Design an enzyme around this catalytic site. Structure first.
Site, PDB file in Angstrom:
ATOM      1  N   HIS A  47       0.883  -1.270   0.058  1.00 12.18           N
ATOM      2  CA  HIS A  47      -0.147  -0.107  -0.029  1.00 12.18           C
ATOM      3  C   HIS A  47       0.699   1.219  -0.143  1.00 12.18           C
ATOM      4  CE1 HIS A  47      -0.002   0.193   4.666  1.00 12.18           C
ATOM      5  NE2 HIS A  47       0.177   1.666   4.293  1.00 12.18           N
TER       6      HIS A  47
ATOM      7  N   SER B 272       3.901   2.056   8.653  1.00 12.76           N
ATOM      8  CA  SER B 272       3.653   0.987   7.498  1.00 12.76           C
ATOM      9  C   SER B 272       4.710   0.543   6.785  1.00 12.76           C
ATOM     10  CB  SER B 272       2.597   2.054   6.464  1.00 12.76           C
ATOM     11  OG  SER B 272       1.528   2.079   7.113  1.00 12.76           O
ATOM     12  N   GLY B 273       4.915  -0.491   6.557  1.00 12.32           N
ATOM     13  CA  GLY B 273       5.863  -1.213   5.749  1.00 12.32           C
ATOM     14  C   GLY B 273       7.135  -1.510   6.658  1.00 12.32           C
TER      15      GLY B 273
ATOM     16  N   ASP C 166      -0.697  -7.539   1.685  1.00  9.96           N
ATOM     17  CA  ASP C 166      -0.034  -6.242   1.661  1.00  9.96           C
ATOM     18  C   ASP C 166       1.422  -6.286   1.968  1.00  9.96           C
ATOM     19  OD1 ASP C 166       0.015  -3.534   1.780  1.00  9.96           O
ATOM     20  OD2 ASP C 166      -0.571  -3.123   3.825  1.00  9.96           O
TER      21      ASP C 166
HETATM   22  O1  CR9 Z   1       0.223   3.663   6.309  1.00 12.05           O
HETATM   23  C1  CR9 Z   1      -0.780   4.335   6.294  1.00 12.05           C
HETATM   24  C2  CR9 Z   1      -0.820   5.151   5.148  1.00 12.05           C
HETATM   25  O2  CR9 Z   1      -0.296   5.129   3.946  1.00 12.05           O
HETATM   26  C3  CR9 Z   1       0.187   6.169   3.073  1.00 12.05           C
HETATM   27  C4  CR9 Z   1       1.424   6.180   3.062  1.00 12.05           C
HETATM   28  C5  CR9 Z   1       1.908   6.749   1.608  1.00 12.05           C
HETATM   29  C6  CR9 Z   1       1.306   6.040   0.380  1.00 12.05           C
HETATM   30  C7  CR9 Z   1       0.212   5.273   0.682  1.00 12.05           C
HETATM   31  C8  CR9 Z   1      -0.612   6.072   1.751  1.00 12.05           C
HETATM   32  C9  CR9 Z   1      -2.037   5.061   2.008  1.00 12.05           C
HETATM   33  C10 CR9 Z   1      -1.969   6.317   5.135  1.00 12.05           C
HETATM   34  C11 CR9 Z   1      -3.014   6.523   6.257  1.00 12.05           C
HETATM   35  C12 CR9 Z   1      -2.817   5.527   7.320  1.00 12.05           C
HETATM   36  C13 CR9 Z   1      -1.407   4.504   7.141  1.00 12.05           C
HETATM   37  C14 CR9 Z   1      -1.515   3.608   8.595  1.00 12.05           C
HETATM   38  N1  CR9 Z   1      -2.260   3.908   9.522  1.00 12.05           N
HETATM   39  C15 CR9 Z   1      -1.729   2.632  10.274  1.00 12.05           C
HETATM   40  C16 CR9 Z   1      -2.336   2.474  11.568  1.00 12.05           C
HETATM   41  C17 CR9 Z   1      -1.372   1.434  12.163  1.00 12.05           C
HETATM   42  C18 CR9 Z   1      -1.679   1.060  13.518  1.00 12.05           C
HETATM   43  N2  CR9 Z   1      -2.688   1.590  14.183  1.00 12.05           N
HETATM   44  N3  CR9 Z   1      -1.289  -0.080  13.997  1.00 12.05           N
HETATM   45  C19 CR9 Z   1      -0.073   1.244  11.686  1.00 12.05           C
HETATM   46  F1  CR9 Z   1       0.819   0.238  12.367  1.00 12.05           F
HETATM   47  C20 CR9 Z   1       0.467   1.639  10.285  1.00 12.05           C
HETATM   48  C21 CR9 Z   1      -0.357   2.468  10.040  1.00 12.05           C
HETATM   49  N4  CR9 Z   1      -0.210   2.922   8.552  1.00 12.05           N
END
Ligand code: CR9
Lengths: 248, 110
Positions: free
Chosen positions: A41, A184-185, A88
């Site tokens: 993502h 994320s990632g 993902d």
């Molecule tokens: O990862 C994420 C995104 O990602 C972005 C990154 C740039 C290109 C794609 C775009 C969608 C956007 C919004 C939110 C998140 C995200 N939320 C989140 C929540 C948690 C959690 N509460 N455990 C995570 F560990 C990681 C993420 N990423």
């Protein structure tokens, strides 16, 4: 990362930052000097001009002048990632390899047959927000959280049947410590001594969650063991590819 | 808890557990050593084998193993796991495989 602490140089040497036009968007884990494992993502329609992505390594402060930055040759993402939440995952091939030093090292994969241990406490790291309505971390953060069973996580009070077989949850029912936006990632690593030496292995890839650190809304990760073969094949198949490619 | 496939940090020789005996055996050298070196590292959770070589029991020693396992080269390229295409053998030449897998998961600070 909410509820974690500042870490130091060399502690988590596989952690990298993926930046698009200057901004840190996702985290990633080095599998070798030139391959990074992250989430699919992180590459939506709008962010697929590889010349605009950089991989930052070997430093825990985002503004360290001592970290290294390399370009991207190709991104191979999972063609079963229907949003383009299961599958993902993606691989990023750097245009040239990073030197491996005491600050830059790859992480291992789970061995064949190696399964996740529910209840085991692993570490998650990243530069994401330290509060949902907060700012990213300037210094890399680390948090220890336990693996939660799917029976618990899929219960109506947690994610009511949204956890599919190739993902898992990690966190505290009470909330308070979790990964968050900007992580994320990134890596979810557990340490073991099955190779007779303690080694850290990448068991999950930070994928999603509802809010961050809320009680009963733990973080969800991609289960890396289920993609071992997809990773071996992708790297054999696309080592010379350039651009965005998809592998199923 | 130990994984059934191990690599030595002294000389990178590959060892595979033999459950009917509770012993570790060497992998007899074959024309498919590259694929076996590559498969063994993957199996263990390493990304790949950087290189591999052949050792000689008479110059390198047994280093606590009891025998050999030989690979069915005809089934080898159909597999995902090593243990399913291996069988005890005599390995007359006494030459076995060593694999240098890409190191990972360890910090290198003082
Ligand atoms: O990862 C994420 C995104 O990602 C972005 C990154 C740039 C290109 C794609 C775009 C969608 C956007 C919004 C939110 C998140 C995200 N939320 C989140 C929540 C948690 C959690 N509460 N455990 C995570 F560990 C990681 C993420 N990423």
């Amino acid at each position: 990362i909410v509820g974690g602490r500042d870490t130091s140089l060399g502690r988590w040497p596989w952690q990298v930052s993926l930046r698009y036009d200057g901004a840190h968007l996702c985290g990633g884990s080095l599998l070798s000097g030139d391959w990074v494992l992250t989430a699919a993502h992180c590459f939506p329609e709008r962010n697929r001009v590889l010349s605009r992505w950089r991989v930052f390594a070997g430093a825990v402060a985002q503004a360290s002048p001592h970290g290294l930055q390399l370009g991207v040759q190709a991104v191979v993402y999972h063609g079963g990632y229907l949003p383009f939440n299961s599958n993902d995952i993606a691989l990023v091939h750097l245009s040239s390899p990073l030197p491996l030093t005491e600050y830059i090292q790859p992480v291992c994969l789970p061995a064949a047959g190696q399964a996740l241990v529910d209840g085991k406490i692993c570490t998650v790291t990243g530069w994401g927000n330290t509060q949902y309505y907060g700012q990213q971390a300037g210094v890399l953060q680390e948090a220890r959280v336990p693996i939660i069973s799917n029976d618990v996580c899929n219960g109506a009070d947690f994610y009511g049947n949204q956890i599919k077989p190739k993902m898992f949850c990690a966190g505290y029912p009470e909330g308070g410590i979790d990964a968050c936006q900007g992580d994320s990632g990134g890596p979810f690593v557990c340490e073991d001594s099955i190779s007779r030496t303690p080694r850290w292995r990448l068991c999950g890839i930070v994928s999603w969650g509802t809010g961050c650190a809320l009680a009963q809304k733990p973080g969800v990760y991609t289960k890396v063991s289920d993609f071992r073969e997809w990773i071996f094949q992708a790297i054999k198949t696309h080592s010379e590819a350039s651009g965005m490619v998809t592998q199923l | 808890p130990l994984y059934p496939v191990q690599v030595s940090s002294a000389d990178a020789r590959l060892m595979v557990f033999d459950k009917t005996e509770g012993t570790w055996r060497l992998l007899c050298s074959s024309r498919s050593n590259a694929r076996v070196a590559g498969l063994s590292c993957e199996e263990m959770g390493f990304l790949r084998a950087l290189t591999h070589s052949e050792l000689d029991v008479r110059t390198a020693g047994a280093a606590g193993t009891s025998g050999f396992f030989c690979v069915d080269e005809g089934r080898l390229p159909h597999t995902q796991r090593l243990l399913e295409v291996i069988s005890v053998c005599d390995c007359p030449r006494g030459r076995f495989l060593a694999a240098i897998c890409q190191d990972c998961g360890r910090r290198k600070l003082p």
